[PDB]
Enzyme design. Structure first.
Site, PDB file in Angstrom:
ATOM      1  N   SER A  45       0.750  -1.257   0.000  1.00  0.00           N
ATOM      2  CA  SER A  45       0.000   0.000   0.000  1.00  0.00           C
ATOM      3  C   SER A  45       0.784   1.315   0.000  1.00  0.00           C
ATOM      4  O   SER A  45       0.184   2.381  -0.165  1.00  0.00           O
ATOM      5  CB  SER A  45      -1.012   0.014   1.147  1.00  0.00           C
ATOM      6  OG  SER A  45      -2.153  -0.755   0.802  1.00  0.00           O
ATOM      7  N   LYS A  48       0.355   3.623  -2.934  1.00  0.00           N
ATOM      8  CA  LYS A  48      -0.806   4.496  -3.062  1.00  0.00           C
ATOM      9  C   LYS A  48      -0.411   5.966  -3.083  1.00  0.00           C
ATOM     10  O   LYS A  48      -1.120   6.799  -3.641  1.00  0.00           O
ATOM     11  CB  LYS A  48      -1.808   4.222  -1.934  1.00  0.00           C
ATOM     12  CG  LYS A  48      -2.489   2.864  -2.078  1.00  0.00           C
ATOM     13  CD  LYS A  48      -3.493   2.593  -0.980  1.00  0.00           C
ATOM     14  CE  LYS A  48      -4.022   1.172  -1.102  1.00  0.00           C
ATOM     15  NZ  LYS A  48      -4.965   0.835  -0.010  1.00  0.00           N
ATOM     16  N   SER A 105      -6.411   3.350   3.551  1.00  0.00           N
ATOM     17  CA  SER A 105      -5.802   2.317   2.722  1.00  0.00           C
ATOM     18  C   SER A 105      -6.856   1.476   2.011  1.00  0.00           C
ATOM     19  O   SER A 105      -6.724   0.258   1.881  1.00  0.00           O
ATOM     20  CB  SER A 105      -4.881   1.413   3.547  1.00  0.00           C
ATOM     21  OG  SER A 105      -3.831   0.913   2.732  1.00  0.00           O
ATOM     22  N   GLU A 141      -4.963  -3.842  -7.260  1.00  0.00           N
ATOM     23  CA  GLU A 141      -5.316  -4.398  -5.952  1.00  0.00           C
ATOM     24  C   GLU A 141      -6.233  -5.595  -6.206  1.00  0.00           C
ATOM     25  O   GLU A 141      -7.120  -5.533  -7.059  1.00  0.00           O
ATOM     26  CB  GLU A 141      -6.067  -3.359  -5.109  1.00  0.00           C
ATOM     27  CG  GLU A 141      -5.238  -2.158  -4.696  1.00  0.00           C
ATOM     28  CD  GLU A 141      -4.196  -2.497  -3.643  1.00  0.00           C
ATOM     29  OE1 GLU A 141      -3.427  -1.595  -3.260  1.00  0.00           O
ATOM     30  OE2 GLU A 141      -4.143  -3.659  -3.195  1.00  0.00           O
TER      31      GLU A 141
END
EC number: 3.5.2.6
Length: 263
Positions: A45, A48, A105, A141
């Site tokens: 993550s 991101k 997240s 994802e």
């Protein structure tokens, strides 16, 4: 020769049983402290931040882009959608998707940001545009979090990520309004209380983005404002030998504590 700081990080690494990657940039004198700083680690993550930054870059020439509503269909939901699930058959603006991806997240939110950029390759393209020649996003994802040992997909090095994070939050890889917006999002993160933040003096202000995945991968990248001194950028990546290893956010807090002493 290794410094006492690198010696402590190595000891921490040995104790944990995994592989630790650290990169500290002290903007006071632009010096760096690295541990396995040029080795690749699965971002999970923490990637991101690059996706959100890429969209911010686009909005520099499209002032209303961040407020553009994006549909959220039932089929868009993946494995962790804390915010996106509240908007199924509804919408979320790119700003809302960015905040959800960075502060909670949310994985569906990330997939929408990736889609806005034309796919994983669009995120990588942004990285190259701002001088990051190491970062690479290959999947969406949730598969980008597999974190298989040796796999170069969806990885970067501590040094590269620290350099890029500095450019994005303290430097000028982004326009004035955009840089501030990124800082605002990172500072409001809700997932990093037990990671880097846990190992920093409580008087320090910080913005961060955590990451976790297979192989007990536990990450965190942050921008830090110590009291009475120039800001810092710190990246702490950690991954383990076995696929179902448990999270080790304490290792990241420990690394931060080590890094903070003597500053």
């Amino acid at each position: 020769q290794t410094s006492a700081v690198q010696q402590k990080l190595a000891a921490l690494e040995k104790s944990s049983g995994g592989r630790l990657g650290v990169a500290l940039i002290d903007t006071a004198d632009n010096t760096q402290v690295l541990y396995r700083g040029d080795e690749r680690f699965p971002m999970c993550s923490t990637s991101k931040v690059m996706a959100a930054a890429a969209v911010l870059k686009q909005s520099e020439t499209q002032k209303q882009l961040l407020n553009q509503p994006v549909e959220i269909k039932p089929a868009d939901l993946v494995n962790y959608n804390p915010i996106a699930e509240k908007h199924v058959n509804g919408t979320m603006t790119l700003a809302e998707l960015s905040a959800a991806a960075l502060q909670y997240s949310d994985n569906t939110a990330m997939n929408k940001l990736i889609a806005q950029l034309g796919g994983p390759g669009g995120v990588t393209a942004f990285a190259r545009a701002i001088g990051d020649e190491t970062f690479r996003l290959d999947r969406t994802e949730p598969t980008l979090n597999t974190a298989i040992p040796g796999d170069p997909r969806d990885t970067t090095t501590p040094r590269a990520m620290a350099q890029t994070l500095r450019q994005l939050t303290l430097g000028h890889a982004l326009g004035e309004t955009q840089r501030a917006q990124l800082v605002t999002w990172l500072k409001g993160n809700t997932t990093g209380a037990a990671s880097i933040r846990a190992g920093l003096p409580t008087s320090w202000t910080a913005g961060d983005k955590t990451g976790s995945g297979g192989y007990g991968t536990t990450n965190d990248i942050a921008v830090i404002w110590p009291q009475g001194r120039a800001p810092l950028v710190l990246v702490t990546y950690f991954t383990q030998p076995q696929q179902n290893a448990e999270s080790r956010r304490d290792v990241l807090a420990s690394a931060a504590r080590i890094i903070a002493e003597g500053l």
